[PDB]
Every structure is written in structure tokens, then in C-alpha cells.
């Protein structure tokens, strides 16, 4: 075939953690950054035991060996009760244009297939569900669980201009389904902004500001970084941070914020049982270790695209939406 | 096989130390924070000796040697007799939902059995005993011993509002049994609140303010940090603290506070002599280097949970209380 | 084998220096803190020389190089003739309850062994001998030598109220033996008070106020703080102080006060030849670099404790008092 490779058109930045009180969301200088700290942890024997271990003497022996570790932790201060998560989002047009492609015959029918898809059903639901996942706060991941209150401030930036698009209560919007009426005037302005940017009509740059009321001293949940037994350190858990040594700030990986944004695919076989999942070529969910959209039940990105392009096996309108959502997510495809 | 994880449902913050005088409990300004200090210690040869040597000559050579060390110390001022320990606690619903699950047929039967548990024997005992361990001050660890008077103020935090749940005399509540029929209305209000949170009905954020009258200038006991012989410092003992650099405040580790709340398990084989212990999959007790709840006796959390779910072997109702209590603790199980 | 550790049950605070005149001991606001000062000191070649160094020109040269140092110094004011030393003492029960132990068999007979010892010959003598070391002012250490007078006011505090246990005359009490049979009623009061606290009967909080008349402007003696070329200080002597920065108060280390309280061991082999010593597991004494109770002879703590507990070889009554005495000193016996 061809060795294509599309570029992501959703470009979120890392989301950095900031701490303050709830009554001062509008006051931008009222939010100090959250830095990582280290603390000692006395481990516990909690994993399933091996076949050998069984015997009470060696379980017991295991419990007396110290098992102590050091972990990263990020928390709100004793006097500040509200996490603040800020990141910018860039939506780019050109979703139908490959950035690389090795078969001249394959490129031609692809762009046509997408172009007329764009032409027919304007990719509004793509923008609508992206938009929705800003308003859910789904990109907060573990920080939304247990929140007293979550208010999300979205603005558009152009030059030196900021424009309030919307202030969404993340807990007033569903995570398991997408609202299809009566939405909101403010939500809808933001789905049309993202769709315009997806399409090419506008230059779109958003500034998200999520505010979670967690309670003084409460632990916040940045991303994890994985580099175990790196020599003398031998620290148990490492969190993610941005900005060099003392200044560095706790953050969620940009791609984790992205993974949340594209969790849209309600269009796969078991979609009513498992709710929405994140658009991936093979509808893979890493936690559950299973692939919705298996290749044998031809509903993966790949089988569908050849059908829809190489053979003109037109697919259903939702699966058509899905393969657009992969091209929006993008990635080397071969 | 099934591989799966559960996230904590009881979420206490670090517990920070403050100082002041017992009269001014209600005045929140009257409490200045406790910072760590360093002090020299001329050490003693106090450990058990090896083969080389119990010879008189080399023992005495060893005592001649200076053996000076530096240690962190936290203590009350010369003019302040009471230690304040403050922390907030969040209680999350969703006990039965695993955070990650490998096999979704195992999830189905797991969420099935736990949901049945919640409906039948409502998790009232769990919130009964978590509540108790707040009301008795078990979370004060070594700071409870010898206290003149411990008064524990607990309050519900709901957006901007703060409502007082109860003021508890921690020396009036047992640490070896959990109280019966006539609990107290204040304790009972609190135990309901924790189970509503455990059960998803309410958003519960509590603020524990614990006052221990100890006497002016008396040493207090934060957590320890285990970094012994790291660097040229040659420091004998590190203590735990939270907050930037010099204004950092001495603290108990959040997970030490949660070990206290989870000391509810009176359901293991020898419990009537040993007393309650903190919930742990293999019923482990680190200070005694022994694992109650051995796998030989199939009383460990895995024997229990496997049986209950894969083979529909109902365990004794106390043992059911235990694995539900493990599930709120959380861990990585598989 | 056992990996026990006992928490200390004698808990004195740091002792802080104040200064005033001898008439006003009863006026608490008539005493003002002693802050440390720096002064310059031109050194002197006073140590023993080393082969090479003994040549005349070499030592002659050694004399002429400045040798200039800075030292901390604490003194009474020009108008204030009396040093006042205040600390608070907590006495805890639970002597025979280890805070940690590894082998379940060892805890078993240990608690029985110690329990019975308490049951039989009650630890009155331990209380008597601590008691006396408050009354002889041993804890004043170098501030005791060459004093016009020494008045030690002891009170017990409970709640908001203080009861005068006694006013002792530390120079009318011996250091080198403990007084024979006939002892003051007030000393008797205090020895019963410490034993009740060691036993568990009462909550014991004492406030010791020692007054030493030494003459206007005289140098007082706090503990020493020992750091070796920490920074570019080149300050040869540092003393201990407690408090913020420049209103920190000269002090004796708490554990120095404690070591003086447990100066009770008249029970080693050479006890008539050397008098009392502070209770250490191997009867060590830092100044003399000697280990009384060497382990060759089976009179150290640990040889004794295994014999008395493991093999039921009960030891001499006086050495049983010692073994109990280490247990209230406490500390990791690894």
C-alpha cells in the first residue's frame, strides 16, 4: 500500500498545577505554583504472594524486612484549598492532508474521500465532542473525583486579545454520553470555534483554566514519570514537572490532556456497554487490556480506510466519524 | 487470570503541627506553627554487640570515640503547652469500581458481589469505625501517650460553609474496642457522614483540629524521614515537614494518618487478645513483624476475595467487612 | 531473637536559662532570658606536641601566628546575680510495654517478667532515685559548682492548676549516694509522684525551677553544639539555644537533663569505688571512656535481660533495678 503519516491537529500544552483559594479565580496573581516534594513511605506486603511464599514463616519474614521508599507527592498548601490547572490548546486545519504518503495512487483517493466527507456532514460532531470534553473537565482525570466544585474558564486568544468563550461547571456535564440539545449558548460557541479551526476557517488558540475545590492540604494528581531503579535513586514513584529544578511545576503530560480530549468514540461494537472511549486506531484501552474495534471484526482504523478508499467500501456514518477522529489525532500509519 | 487496582477512598491530608495555649482553642490566630530545629547529641554505645568485640578493650575504645550526631527536633515553645494537629479528610464514594481491571467478566462478578454487600449490610460499620478512630485521636500516634487532655474538633466543609460535626474528648473513647449501643449523637452524626461519603450520597470534606495538652516546652512527635547516612551531613534523625524552605511546618505523613483511620480490623483469628489492627491484605503488623491473616488459614484478603467472587463462597460476615475495608483502603491486586 | 525498642518514660523539656536577682524568685516576670553572645578569643598553644613540633623554633613560630577564634558565651547581666533554669518533666507509664518487638515469644515472657517485678518489688526505688536527682540539682551540671545557694522549686501541673510539690535545697542533698532512710516529707512526696507516673496511676507533669546564685556578670553554662568547620565559620565553640533567631534563649539539651535524672546506677561492680552513674546498657561513661558492666562479665543490660526472660535466671535485686532502669530510659535495643 502506502506509508502515510498524519500530524495531530489537536495540540494541547502540558497542564501545570497551581494552588490558591476559591474566591480568587479572577485574580491571576492569587495562584502559587505547586512544586513536587519527597516523602518517606514504609511499604506494606500487599501483592499476591508467589507459589513459594505461602508458608507463614517466609511471609512473616517478609514483613520484618524494612521495605522503605521515597515517593514524589504534590499537594495543596495548608492555607489554599483549590487546585488550578491551566493549559493552552491549538486546533489546526488540514486534517485531510497527509504530511507524508508514499503511494501517489493512495493519497489521491484518500483526500477526495475526506474532502467530500468534510463537504457533506461538516465535521461538527467531532468539534462538538472535543468541545464537550473541555466542558466535562475530563482532562482533570483523578483530580475531578471528589471535587466540591469545578469551574472551567475557556478563552480564545488572538494577538493580544482574550475573549471569554465560556465558563463551564464540569460537574453539570455528562462524561458517559454527549449532550445533543439543548446544549448551551456558551458551550455551542466553543464547538463551532473548534470545528471552524478543525476545518480551516479560523486560527484557534484557547486558554483553559480549570478550578477544582479539593480542600486545604489535599493531594493533587499530576502525571507519573516512569524510570525505576535508575541507579542510586531507587525512588518508588516519580511525578511529572516542567521548568528546571527549584522552579519546576507539577504537571499533567500534554498527551494525557490530549488522550482525554479525544475520548469520543461511542461508535464501536460494545459502545453502549463501555461508554465513550478515546479515539485510537484499534480502539485500545490500556487499563482494561482489551481492544474494542478488533481487526477480525473489521472495525479498526486500518481495515476501514482501505475499504473506504482503496475499494470504495463506504462505511457507516459513525465509523466514518471515527476514522476522521483518528486523522485528527494523527500518527504514523504503517 | 485477572489484574486490577483500586484507588483510596479515605483521603487525609498531611497533618501539620501548631503550638499555643489550651485556653485559646477557639481563636485560630493563637496557634503559631512548629518548625524543626537541629541539635547535637553525644551518642551512646547502646546496641547489641557483634562477635568483634565483647572484649573489654575494644568496647572501651568504642566509648572513647566521640560519636556525635545531629537530629531534627520539634517541640512546643517555652510559653505554649498545647499541640494543635490540623488536617482535612475527604471521603470518596465508588468503593466497588476498580481503578483498573484486566478482565471485564471478573469486574462484572466483583462489582456484583460488592454492590450486593453494600445493599444488604450497608457499609455502616466501616463508617462507624473510621469515625471512631477520628473521635479517639488514634491518628495522634505517639503524641497521644501521656496527654493531659485531648480535644478533637471536627467540622464539615461544604463550599464556603463550615458546620461543626462534633467536639470529642479523645480520652473518653476506647482504642481497643469500638463503642456500643449508646455511642453519642455527635459520634453518630459523624459515622453517618462518613458512610454517606463512602456510599456516594454526599460530598464530604472534614477538617480535624486536634488539641493535645502536653506542657510547655515538651517535645512533640512528627513523622520521621528515612534518609540515614545520605551525604556528608551525617545526621542521625530526620523529621517530616511541609512547606517551601524555612517556614516549613512539622507534620505527620498523610499515610500515617490513614493508617490510623483504617485501624478497624477486629476480624482476624487472634483479635480478641491483640486488639484492632490496621486493614492490610495479609493482615500485616510491621512493629510486631507478624502477619495475622495468614494464607495458610485462608483469612488473607486474596483467599477471601477470590472465593467470594470466582466460586460464590460467602465468607463470614466479619470477613466480608474486612475485604470491603481492604477495597476502600485501595491497592494493586493481581 | 528479639528486636525490641522501648520509648523513654522520662521526658524532660529543654532547660532554658533566665537571669535575675535572688530576692525575686517568686516574681516570675522578674527573670529575663539569657541570649548568647559572641566574643573574640586569642588562642594559646596548650596541647601536647607531636615529635616534630617539639623543636624550639617550630613551637616558637606556632606561638606567633595569631590563632584567633570566636566563641559563644552566656553570662549573667551586670545587675543580676542569679541564674534561673526552668524545664518541665513528664513521666509516663507502660514501662514493660515495648513499642515494638519482633519475636512473639520474647514479648510474652518480657512483659510477664517486668510485670511481675512491678507486681513484687514495686519500682519505688526508681522513683526515689529520679526524685533525688531533681532534688540535688544534678541536672544543673557545671552550673552547680561553686554556688552561694541553689533553690529548686518543683510543682505539679494538672489542667489550669499547679500544686507546690516542694522547694528543695540542692546543696543539702548528696550527689554521691542517695539519702539513707530518713528523707524529707517533700522529697517523699515527689518520689511517690514519679513512681505513680511510672506505674500508670496518675498523669504527672512537673515544672522544675532551679535558682543558682553565682554573682553578677558571672558566666553560665549551657549545652554545647558541635559542628566541625561547618561553613567558613572558624568559630571554635557554639552553645545551645532555643527560639527564633536573636531572641533564642540559652539552654541545656533535654537529653542532658535526662542523663542527669537517671544518674542512679549504684549497682555495677565498682559502684562503691566510683559512685552513681547514668543508666546505660553497657554502663558506659563518656568522660572516663570506661565501660562499667562490660559484657565479658555478664552484667550488661542484654546478658541480664536474656537470662532473666529467656532462661528465667533471675538476677540480683540491685541489677533487677538496673534492668528496669534501662527500660524507662528506653531506646532501640537492636
Residue numbers in the entry:
A (entry chain E), B (entry chain F), C (entry chain G): 10 to 343
Authors' text:
In the type I-F system, several Csy genes comprise a silencing Cascade complex with the Csy3 protein as a backbone-forming molecule. Based on the P. aeruginosa Cascade complex with a protein-helical backbone of six Csy3s, ZmCsy3 is predicted to form the molecular-helical backbone of the Z. mobilis Cascade complex.
The monomeric ZmCsy3 structure is composed of ten α-helices (α1-α10) and eight β-strands (β1–β8) and forms a right-handed glove that is composed of a finger of several α-helices, a palm consisting of a β-sheet of 6 β-strands with an extended region (web), a thumb composed of a two-stranded β-sheet and an α-helix, and the backside of glove. The seven ZmCsy3 molecules in the asymmetric unit form an inter-molecular helical structure. The inter-molecular helix formed by seven ZmCsy3 molecules is part of a long superhelical filament structure in the entire crystal system, where seven molecules form a single turn with a diameter of ∼95 Å and a length of ∼82 Å. Since this molecular-helical structure is formed in the absence of crRNA in the crystalline state, there is a possibility that ZmCsy3 can be aggregated at high protein concentrations to form a molecular helical backbone of the Cascade effector complex without crRNA. The hexameric molecular-helix formed by ZmCsy3s, except for one ZmCsy3 subunit at either end in the apo-backbone structure, superimposes well onto the PaCsy3 helix backbone in the holo-Cascade structure, with rmsd values of less than 2.51 Å among the aligned 1912 Ca atoms, and only a negligible difference at the crRNA binding regions.
